[PDB]
Amino acid sequence: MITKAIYPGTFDPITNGHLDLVTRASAMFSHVILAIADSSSKKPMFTLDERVALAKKVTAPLKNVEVLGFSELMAEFAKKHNANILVRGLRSVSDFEYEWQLANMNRHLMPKLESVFLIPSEKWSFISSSLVKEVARHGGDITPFLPKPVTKALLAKLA
Amino acid sequence: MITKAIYPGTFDPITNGHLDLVTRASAMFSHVILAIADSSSKKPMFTLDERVALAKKVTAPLKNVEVLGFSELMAEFAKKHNANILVRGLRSVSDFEYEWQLANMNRHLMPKLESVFLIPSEKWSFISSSLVKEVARHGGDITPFLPKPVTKALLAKLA
Amino acid sequence: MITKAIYPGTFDPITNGHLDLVTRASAMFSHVILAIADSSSKKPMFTLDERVALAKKVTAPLKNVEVLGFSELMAEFAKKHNANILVRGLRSVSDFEYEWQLANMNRHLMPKLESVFLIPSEKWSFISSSLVKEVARHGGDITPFLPKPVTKALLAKLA
Amino acid sequence: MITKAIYPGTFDPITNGHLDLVTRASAMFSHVILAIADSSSKKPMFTLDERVALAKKVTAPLKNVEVLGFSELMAEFAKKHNANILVRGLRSVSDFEYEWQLANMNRHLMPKLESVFLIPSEKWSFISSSLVKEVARHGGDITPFLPKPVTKALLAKLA
Amino acid sequence: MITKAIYPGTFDPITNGHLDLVTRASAMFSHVILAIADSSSKKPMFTLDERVALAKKVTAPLKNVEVLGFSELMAEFAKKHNANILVRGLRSVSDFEYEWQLANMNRHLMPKLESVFLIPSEKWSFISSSLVKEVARHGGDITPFLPKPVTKALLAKLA
Amino acid sequence: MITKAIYPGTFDPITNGHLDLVTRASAMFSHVILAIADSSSKKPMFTLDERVALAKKVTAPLKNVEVLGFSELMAEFAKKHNANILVRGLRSVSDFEYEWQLANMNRHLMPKLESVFLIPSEKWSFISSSLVKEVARHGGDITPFLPKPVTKALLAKLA
Numbered sequence: 001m002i003t004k005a006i007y008p009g010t011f012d013p014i015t016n017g018h019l020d021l022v023t024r025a026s027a028m029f030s031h032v033i034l035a036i037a038d039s040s041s042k043k044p045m046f047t048l049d050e051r052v053a054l055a056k057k058v059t060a061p062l063k064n065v066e067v068l069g070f071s072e073l074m075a076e077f078a079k080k081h082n083a084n085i086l087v088r089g090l091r092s093v094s095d096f097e098y099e100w101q102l103a104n105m106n107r108h109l110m111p112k113l114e115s116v117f118l119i120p121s122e123k124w125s126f127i128s129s130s131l132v133k134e135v136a137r138h139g140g141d142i143t144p145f146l147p148k149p150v151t152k153a154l155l156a157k158l159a
Numbered sequence: 160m161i162t163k164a165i166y167p168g169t170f171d172p173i174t175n176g177h178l179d180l181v182t183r184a185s186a187m188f189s190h191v192i193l194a195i196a197d198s199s200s201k202k203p204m205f206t207l208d209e210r211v212a213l214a215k216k217v218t219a220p221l222k223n224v225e226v227l228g229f230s231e232l233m234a235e236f237a238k239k240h241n242a243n244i245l246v247r248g249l250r251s252v253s254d255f256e257y258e259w260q261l262a263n264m265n266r267h268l269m270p271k272l273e274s275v276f277l278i279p280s281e282k283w284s285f286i287s288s289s290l291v292k293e294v295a296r297h298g299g300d301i302t303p304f305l306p307k308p309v310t311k312a313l314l315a316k317l318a
Numbered sequence: 319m320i321t322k323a324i325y326p327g328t329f330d331p332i333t334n335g336h337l338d339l340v341t342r343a344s345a346m347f348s349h350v351i352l353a354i355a356d357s358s359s360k361k362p363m364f365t366l367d368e369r370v371a372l373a374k375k376v377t378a379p380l381k382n383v384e385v386l387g388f389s390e391l392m393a394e395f396a397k398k399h400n401a402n403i404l405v406r407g408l409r410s411v412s413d414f415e416y417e418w419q420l421a422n423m424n425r426h427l428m429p430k431l432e433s434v435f436l437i438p439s440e441k442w443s444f445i446s447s448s449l450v451k452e453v454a455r456h457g458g459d460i461t462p463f464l465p466k467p468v469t470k471a472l473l474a475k476l477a
Numbered sequence: 478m479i480t481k482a483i484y485p486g487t488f489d490p491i492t493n494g495h496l497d498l499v500t501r502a503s504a505m506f507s508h509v510i511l512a513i514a515d516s517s518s519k520k521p522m523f524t525l526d527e528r529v530a531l532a533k534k535v536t537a538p539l540k541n542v543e544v545l546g547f548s549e550l551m552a553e554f555a556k557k558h559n560a561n562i563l564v565r566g567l568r569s570v571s572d573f574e575y576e577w578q579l580a581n582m583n584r585h586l587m588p589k590l591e592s593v594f595l596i597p598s599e600k601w602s603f604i605s606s607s608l609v610k611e612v613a614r615h616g617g618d619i620t621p622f623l624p625k626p627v628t629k630a631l632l633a634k635l636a
Numbered sequence: 637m638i639t640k641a642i643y644p645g646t647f648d649p650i651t652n653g654h655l656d657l658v659t660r661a662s663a664m665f666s667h668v669i670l671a672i673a674d675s676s677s678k679k680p681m682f683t684l685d686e687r688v689a690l691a692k693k694v695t696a697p698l699k700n701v702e703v704l705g706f707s708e709l710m711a712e713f714a715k716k717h718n719a720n721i722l723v724r725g726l727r728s729v730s731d732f733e734y735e736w737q738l739a740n741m742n743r744h745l746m747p748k749l750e751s752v753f754l755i756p757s758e759k760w761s762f763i764s765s766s767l768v769k770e771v772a773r774h775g776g777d778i779t780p781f782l783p784k785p786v787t788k789a790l791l792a793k794l795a
Numbered sequence: 796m797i798t799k800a801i802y803p804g805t806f807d808p809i810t811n812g813h814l815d816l817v818t819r820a821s822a823m824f825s826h827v828i829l830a831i832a833d834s835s836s837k838k839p840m841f842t843l844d845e846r847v848a849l850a851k852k853v854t855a856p857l858k859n860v861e862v863l864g865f866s867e868l869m870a871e872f873a874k875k876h877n878a879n880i881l882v883r884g885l886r887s888v889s890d891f892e893y894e895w896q897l898a899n900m901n902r903h904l905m906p907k908l909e910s911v912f913l914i915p916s917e918k919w920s921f922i923s924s925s926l927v928k929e930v931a932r933h934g935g936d937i938t939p940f941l942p943k944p945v946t947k948a949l950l951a952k953l954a
């Protein structure tokens with residue numbers, strides 16, 4: 001039996017929370033696409049190419065993980081790649097509303113794609129990317145929250 | 160790659176919500192144990208044997224689902240059955256607290272068992288077993304909420 | 319156009335929160351039944367007759383409010399009284415889950431009965447009956463939380 | 478006894494969720510104004526005139542519903558129209574905070590206007606307008622979520 | 637300036653979460669009473685004397701912490717001890733409702749006593765005493781969740 | 796024993812909710828800095844100097860409160876001022892997520908700074924600054940929500 005899962009997000013940038021979730025998804029499913037949405041209208045700090053390069057560095061040890069950027073409808077991209085499982089995180093109760101909305105919308109768009117949720121380790125659940133960037137903008141130490149090469153890119157982006 | 164998942168609960172009795180979640184788990188994983196906890200101290204309405212018999216009737220069409228009752232530590236039962244994935248439902252934000260507590264406890268008890276969460280269909284998410292029993296006690300129609308043989312057993316239990 | 323609303327609860331005992339909600343419902347609808355469920359299996363402190371007598375004293379100034387005790391299915395009682403609107407309170411986010419479950423169940427039981435929700439005044443929203451009783455058991459002052467005759471009955475019940 | 482209710486919102490555009498709530502309000506109250514706030518500072522996709530025209534098409538079968546655009550304080554508009562009831566939706570727990578804030582503010586602005594809340598059908602509760610627009614921008618099917626003429630206008634707005 | 641804080645609870649038994657909160661309160665305030673409510677009607681597993689003895693062992697290194705059992709109204713006990721600050725934990729969003737209710741009730745009972753809240757370390761926030769006892773009843777390892785002497789007493793209580 | 800607390804925020808502008816929290820913090824701690832973040836990237840309505848002047852007027856009666864504007868990392872500012880306690884508000888469950896994220900981030904940035912939370916009076920808990928500004932923009936009365944001199948400045952800012 002073969003599961004092809006998609007882990008979609010803007011990953012701007014990939015964090016230690018994302019790394020925990022993709023590592024766990026990697027262990028459970030045959031193949032995982034870490035799918036990075038262009039999200040142009042959402043004004044990312046890093047370009048799609050920069051985000052893809054960071055995610056590849058961070059997920060390199062995971063054999064059955066593939067990083068792909070995409071600009072289309074997520075449901076269309078999943079269909080294209082024959083994915084049948086969408087994996088998303090729930091850091092705390094507050095994440096539930098939007099995951100429920102997305103999962104219901106995706107149910108309409110691609111009835112065969114099942115959404116499943118993982119709760120990140122307690123080490124990473126409080127991590128908000130906006131707050132990490134805010135701390136970085138003020139020169140605060142963000143090394144615990146991001147992979148090494150991500151910390152390096154973020155600091156460079158802000159210097 | 161082979162996933163053996165456990166879907167544990169008291170299932171007192173199995174509802175259309177449980178049926179939706181086990182059917183979806185059945186489609187995703189190689190094998191699913193629908194594991195019914197004795198839960199003696201939690202005072203179930205149906206005996207363990209009655210609950211196992213109902214769950215077998217309701218899950219009979221699902222080839223790769225096995226129904227087993229258990230009285231021990233859930234983590235010990237999973238280890239015994241070489242399960243590596245625990246599947247649980249999240250009906251709404253309110254279910255998150257207890258799933259987060261259980262998942263963290265289970266992480267300590269069996270570090271290799273991953274917990275994953277499914278959100279039931281909008282058709283069934285509002286279903287509370289206590290409220291279904293309350294309605295049944297007052298002679299109200301509960302046919303939409305439970306499989307046919309479960310409705311039959313519940314009505315008999317209450318007549 | 320004529321609205322007959324039902325405001326159902328265990329009212330064990332009626333509080334200043336209930337009084338605020340029934341007073342507001344009284345102002346909006348043609349007629350309001352303040353319907354007191356027997357709720358025998360839920361072990362009320364006050365008998366149904368005691369609860370009905372307290373609610374009558376407290377709602378006496380409200381011309382178009384009628385207090386009735388009932389032991390059947392709430393939906394059946396509403397049908398019996400030709401009620402088309404069920405009014406319930408939401409004190410805070412935490413009350414939402416159970417109101418959503420009840421409203422969906424009631425939708426199945428009586429499709430024509432509409433449930434509508436009021437948020438109690440900030441003066442009363444934090445009031446929990448269990449906590450008021452707990453404070454009363456320890457001789458603490460509960461006069462702000464209950465109508466005068468209710469405070470009198472509760473104190474007598476506990477002396 | 479006569480209830481004039483106001484159902485205020487930005488309605489950008491009116492959705493099947495709004496239609497469900499206004500239809501239910503229509504059944505309960507003598508008259509309903511579906512009041513569309515200009516909300517200029519909130520940058521709507523559709524002009525006020527476009528939104529009013531869509532809401533009129535969608536609410537045409539409801540005899541006692543009137544659609545009006547307004548740019549002033551909602552409380553002032555309600556006073557102007559002698560409305561005594563404000564109806565708003567609660568899709569899930571997450572909507573509670575803002576409704577509680579608005580209702581308290583409106584209590585100060587117009588003490589006689591009562592706010593009352595309806596929970597939309599399970600068919601529509603997960604619908605977020607931002608997410609529907611996002612799906613539409615990517616060419617995904619949004620026909621289940623919006624009335625036919627709204628789907629038509631949205632698609633045209635985005636082509 | 638001198639702060640005498642009270643940290644009240646049933647402490648049945650004291651956990652590593654309680655220890656974290658009392659240690660932090662100890663660092664901030666001049667004196668802390670760790671106040672153990674008899675809570676007879678709430679059916680504790682450990683007697684008041686057993687709970688007091690466990691809390692004394694666990695808080696012994698904290699110079700300015702005093703452990704006292706009490707059976708009266710918490711507000712009366714605080715007044716008796718001239719406490720002006722009540723410290724309580726918030727493990728997650730789900731704890732907020734009851735703390736808000738208690739704090740408002742305590743405001744009425746003793747207007748000069750201020751309630752203040754601490755969030756436990758991420759190491760301990762998921763710990764539920766009921767779930768720890770449930771795991772202990774089934775022979776599971778609970779050593780990470782309770783101080784050593786508490787683990788010893790609990791195991792003995794259950795053997 | 797000496798507590799130096801910091802109460803940080805954008806205070807754009809200071810509200811009666813902030814005044815309640817700082818007054819309570821003033822009563823509990825030896826010294827309180829009401830610290831106003833420049834928050835340039837968050838586009839405040841009032842300049843930092845305007846916000847500092849308003850906060851000084853409103854906190855003038857509080858002997859042990861000092862108002863200071865700052866543009867750096869909050870943790871760095873606290874270290875600079877030898878603060879050991881950070882005080883923040885929790886108006887309702889909805890505020891918990893962001894306070895938990897901030898508190899965890901601040902734990903990493905300055906391990907010795909303890910965060911503690913106060914719940915504002917029921918009089919002020921529903922107050923949202925964005926909604927007060929929205930009401931002010933439409934000429935509605937906001938006098939209950941802001942100190943007198945703040946109402947004066949806001950009205951002038953909007954005329």
Ligand SMILES: CC(C)(COP(=O)(O)OP(=O)(O)OC[C@H]1O[C@@H](n2cnc3c(N)ncnc32)[C@H](O)[C@@H]1OP(=O)(O)O)[C@@H](O)C(=O)NCCC(=O)NCCS
Pocket residue numbers: 008009010011012037039072073074075094095096098099102103105106128129130131608611612615
């Ligand atoms: C991109 C897409 C997957 C959303 O992903 P995402 O959650 O926004 O991406 P990320 O996990 O990397 O995080 C994005 C932002 O929202 C936050 N976020 C993510 N999940 C969240 C949740 N469930 N609740 C609240 N915030 C959340 C992120 O943390 C980040 O905020 P931050 O910058 O402060 O960290 C989704 O919109 C998508 O499928 N895009 C393609 C177009 C499409 O198909 N749209 C319709 C899908 S139904």
Ligand SMILES: CC(C)(COP(=O)(O)OP(=O)(O)OC[C@H]1O[C@@H](n2cnc3c(N)ncnc32)[C@H](O)[C@@H]1OP(=O)(O)O)[C@@H](O)C(=O)NCCC(=O)NCCS
Pocket residue numbers: 167168169170171196198231232233234253254255257258261262264265287288289290767770771774
């Ligand atoms: C049995 C066990 C899996 C819990 O399962 P469960 O969720 O209670 O079983 P069910 O899904 O059938 O429901 C049980 C009751 O709690 C409710 N419930 C289930 N999940 C819930 C959630 N996350 N939040 C709130 N309520 C929930 C159920 O609906 C039911 O209530 P109801 O009678 O009104 O319907 C768990 O305690 C267990 O693993 N037992 C074995 C012993 C053990 O190992 N304990 C330690 C595990 S960390």
Ligand SMILES: CC(C)(COP(=O)(O)OP(=O)(O)OC[C@H]1O[C@@H](n2cnc3c(N)ncnc32)[C@H](O)[C@@H]1OP(=O)(O)O)[C@@H](O)C(=O)NCCC(=O)NCCS
Pocket residue numbers: 290293294297326327328329330355357390391392393412413414416417420421423424446447448449
């Ligand atoms: C009685 C009935 C209306 C529920 O009412 P109720 O909310 O329990 O009655 P009250 O408002 O007086 O409060 C009952 C208890 O639950 C609490 N409560 C009420 N609404 C709540 C909410 N939505 N969320 C959490 N707790 C709530 C009450 O405060 C009280 O607890 P307390 O003793 O600490 O104060 C309902 O079960 C009923 O319709 N009974 C008749 C039988 C029936 O038809 N059942 C099926 C209906 S779908």
Ligand SMILES: CC(C)(COP(=O)(O)OP(=O)(O)OC[C@H]1O[C@@H](n2cnc3c(N)ncnc32)[C@H](O)[C@@H]1OP(=O)(O)O)[C@@H](O)C(=O)NCCC(=O)NCCS
Pocket residue numbers: 485486487488489514516549550551552571572573575576579580582583605606607608926929930933
């Ligand atoms: C317009 C007004 C009624 C708010 O209405 P509204 O809820 O924003 O309008 P809609 O229901 O059509 O939705 C507006 C946006 O916020 C969302 N929303 C609506 N209610 C919500 C809730 N309670 N919680 C979270 N989001 C909500 C909507 O879905 C929409 O977001 P989307 O574009 O992703 O769909 C209100 O601000 C108003 O009265 N305006 C007039 C000026 C005024 O009087 N202001 C002070 C009133 S106290």
Ligand SMILES: CC(C)(COP(=O)(O)OP(=O)(O)OC[C@H]1O[C@@H](n2cnc3c(N)ncnc32)[C@H](O)[C@@H]1OP(=O)(O)O)[C@@H](O)C(=O)NCCC(=O)NCCS
Pocket residue numbers: 449452453456644645646647648673675708709710711730731732734735738739741742764765766767
């Ligand atoms: C005892 C008293 C302080 C409550 O304390 P407490 O929170 O129940 O005591 P603990 O922190 O040790 O925990 C008690 C139980 O409720 C849980 N709990 C504690 N705080 C909680 C919260 N805010 N939300 C949900 N559950 C909570 C505990 O974890 C424990 O459950 P568990 O056995 O699964 O672990 C309170 O009722 C009191 O002041 N008692 C004296 C009498 C009185 O004055 N009453 C009126 C006070 S307003």
Ligand SMILES: CC(C)(COP(=O)(O)OP(=O)(O)OC[C@H]1O[C@@H](n2cnc3c(N)ncnc32)[C@H](O)[C@@H]1OP(=O)(O)O)[C@@H](O)C(=O)NCCC(=O)NCCS
Pocket residue numbers: 131134135138803804805806807832834867868869870889890891893894897898900901923924925926
């Ligand atoms: C400024 C800082 C303290 C945040 O404070 P703040 O909460 O935003 O300031 P205020 O209390 O005056 O309110 C700011 C806005 O967010 C809202 N808000 C405040 N606390 C909130 C909460 N916990 N949840 C949701 N919204 C909240 C405010 O009400 C206001 O919104 P409004 O304009 O509608 O009223 C924080 O970002 C900071 O420390 N800044 C300095 C830079 C830094 O060190 N960053 C990293 C800290 S971990």
